[PDB]
Amino acid sequence: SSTPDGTWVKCRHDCFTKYKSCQMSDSCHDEQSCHQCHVKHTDCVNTGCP
What we know:
Layout: H1 8-24, H2 31-48
Helix pairs in contact: 1-2
PDB class: toxin
Keywords: toxin
Assembly: monomeric
């Protein structure tokens, strides 16, 4: 029972904004296409903050 980190989460948020930005992109036309944004976030997070 402890917090994960504080800077590592900044990555989650960093890629999150990039993800939200992806959802704001017109690439979010399909659910899968928007899912890719989430998946990119997942990979972004996996790489930026595994």
